[PDB]
Design a binder for this molecule. Structure first.
Ligand SMILES: [Mg+2]
Length: 644
């Protein structure tokens, strides 16, 4: 009766009901009744029986639009002494015909200008709507303007909020805060930051000490919850954003304003800074012995890039820093290798695979695609952050404090079975573990014994699909790929709202509980599941925004390479053709089913293969192919390939 509409191929789609069973109904284009992708609708089941799989439905009314603003290109032409206005929506799932309100059009608005429009009225029987221009965004051919339009279409805020920046500018460094009894003075320790050269997120610093029995690790995290009070204007805006946004060209939309992100909560060299420390003692095998969490004061001694540290590692350079910093870094790498070995022993799934980035010029035009490489300095830093994240999750759990976990459930038996059959056709071994009971360690061993297989890349790709997305939950579910029964996000509160919330929980329950009421603690506890829901919903939008931006920029790059031949492998098979992942750029192009030579090919859904009816030739996931880039579909932002 009520559900969320999702539009797909050919702008038919399906409705996911709001009931407990979350039942799915198919809806054909002709039965949408003016509804758009993501809208909440009232729907009825069709009096037709069942073709198969699921029931069919029709939309009755729209209960709530997914969006109020839509991006599009504005066109103006004069025909017969009369101006004619047209909008071409950016989103190919926006299928309605638009009548542009002329009183919304500035006299100076030229053709090929990106705009945002709203729907003023619509006619569900004719798929016609009246729209008004609400924002003029800029030249429609400018790639940065298209990236900003994509954010708007995904409901992602990117304009600076001056009110919030003004509130943030009132905050300052209180010199007396370091003399509070609850705040440990750590200003003598040789903390350092290690980050990408371009990053302005400097909210974590590390120091590692050797003791005779092993190591002491200090992970110092900028004390953002100390600066951002719950339900302040800054907090509300951060909670709306949920996260910083990262797009190509190192374009960042920060979750928090500048006076926090670049000053008071930026652990800049030689500045006193207030932090929350996770201090963990290890034995000489990398096993955790003890831990403490506490507010502190530090002075970072150095700001390093991954590049500087890696070059120092392979003796291709040297670091101009104190000897205390050198020894901390050496112990950090030693400790990190030990921690890595212990986590592999207990069970953890290394899902590393090929990853790329798009290089753009100063005008945001894409230049080339780079493959990212394994880096020993990132691996060390990430290893230490993971152990802090897991430790904080256990400390909060041990103290019976409700929190948002970062969870990643074990995948179902049926999904594993499907995976095993697909990859078996590629000479990936048959695993011996029980599919009901499979542990993180057992998946790791399975991956390890196939590391030399030529199809290891599609193996990891398919495994990642099988595992699906991690998410946040207040219920204590495992994190199957990290390998822990309890895990959360604690080390990045400058750019993730969950980490900010975790910090608030520490303060209100462990650090200074006497300064808060039980109603404050219970008010936050009661809101945790809605915070998790909003962050989860917005994470889907952010991932979609990244996918949109990557498809836009990569097809823009590929539009200058028509006729080029690419080698690659089949990454997916659908009823409308073959997706081939190109070796040279890691991007999926579409080979349309109808145009495949030498036979008539039929989609077989159970194995997800195309089979030729006359020759029995099979296309399957993992197959190696060569294909010619024949066109760019700019409507759907797809690269179309033809087999050669
Ligand atoms: Mg960092």
């Amino acid at each position: 009766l009520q559900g969320i509409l999702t539009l797909g191929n050919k702008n038919s789609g399906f409705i996911r009901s709001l009931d407990d069973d979350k039942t799915v109904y198919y809806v054909h284009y002709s039965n949408l009744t003016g509804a758009l992708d993501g809208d909440l609708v009232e729907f009825c089941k069709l009096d037709k029986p069942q073709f198969g799989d699921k029931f069919d439905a029709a939309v009755i009314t729209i209960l709530k639009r997914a969006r109020i603003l839509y991006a599009g290109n504005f066109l103006v032409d004069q025909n017969e002494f009369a101006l004619e206005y047209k909008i071409v929506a950016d989103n190919p799932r926006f299928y309605l015909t638009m009548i542009v309100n002329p009183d919304s059009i500035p006299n100076n608005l030229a053709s090929n200008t990106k705009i945002a429009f709203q729907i003023d009225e619509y006619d569900p029987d004719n798929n016609l709507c009246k729209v008004s221009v609400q924002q003029v965004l800029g030249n429609n051919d400018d790639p940065l303007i298209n990236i900003k339009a994509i954010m708007l279409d995904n409901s992602i805020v990117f304009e600076t909020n001056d009110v919030v920046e003004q509130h943030a500018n009132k905050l300052s460094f209180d010199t007396e805060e370091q003399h509070k009894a609850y705040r440990q003075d750590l200003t003598d320790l040789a903390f350092v930051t290690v980050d990408p050269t371009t990053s302005k997120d400097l909210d974590d610093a590390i120091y590692v000490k050797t003791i005779p029995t092993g190591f002491v690790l200090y992970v110092a995290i900028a004390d953002v919850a100390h600066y951002v009070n719950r339900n302040s204007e800054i907090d509300i805006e951060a909670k709306h954003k949920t996260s910083s946004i990262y797009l190509p060209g190192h374009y960042v939309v920060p979750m928090l304003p500048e006076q926090l992100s670049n000053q008071l909560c930026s652990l800049n060299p030689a500045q006193k800074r207030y932090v929350v420390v996770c201090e963990i003692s290890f034995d000489n095998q990398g096993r955790i012995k003890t831990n403490k969490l506490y507010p502190a004061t530090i002075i970072s001694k150095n700001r390093f890039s991954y590049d500087q540290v890696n070059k120092w590692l392979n003796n291709k350079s040297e670091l101009n820093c104190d000897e205390t910093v050198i020894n901390s870094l050496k112990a950090a790498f030693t400790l990190s290798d030990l921690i890595q070995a212990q986590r592999q022993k207990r069970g953890t799934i290394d899902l590393s695979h090929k990853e790329t980035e798009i290089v753009v010029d100063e005008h945001y035009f894409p230049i080339k695609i780079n493959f990212l490489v394994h880096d020993k300095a990132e691996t060390m830093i990430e290893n230490l952050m993971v152990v802090a994240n897991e430790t904080v999750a256990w400390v909060l759990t041990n103290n019976k404090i409700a929190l948002p976990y970062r969870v990643h459930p074990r995948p179902s038996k049926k999904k594993l079975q499907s995976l095993i059959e697909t990859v078996g056709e590629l000479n990936i071994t048959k695993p011996q573990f029980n599919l009901d009971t499979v542990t993180s360690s057992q998946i790791a061993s399975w991956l390890n014994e196939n590391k030399d297989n030529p199809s290891y890349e599609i193996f990891v790709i398919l495994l990642l699909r099988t595992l699906g997305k991690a998410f946040y939950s207040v219920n204590p579910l495992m994190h199957f790929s990290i390998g822990s029964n309890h895990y959360t996000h604690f080390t990045s509160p400058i750019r993730r709202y969950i980490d900010l919330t975790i910090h608030r929980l520490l303060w209100m329950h462990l650090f200074t509980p006497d300064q808060f009421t039980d109603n404050e603690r219970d008010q936050l506890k009661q809101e945790l599941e809605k915070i998790a829901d909003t962050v989860n919903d917005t994470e889907i939008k952010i991932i979609n925004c990244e996918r949109n931006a990557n498809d836009y920029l990569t097809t823009l790059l590929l539009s200058k390479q028509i006729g080029k031949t690419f080698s690659g492998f089949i990454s997916a098979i659908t009823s409308f053709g073959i997706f081939m992942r190109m070796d040279e750029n890691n991007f999926d192009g579409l080979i349309k089913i109808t145009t495949i030579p030498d036979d008539f090919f039929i989609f077989e859904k159970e194995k997800m293969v195309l089979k030729g009816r006359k020759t029995n030739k099979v296309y399957k996931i993992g197959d190696r192919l060569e294909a010619k880039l024949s066109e760019i579909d700019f409507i759907q932002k797809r690269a179309i390939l033809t087999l050669i």
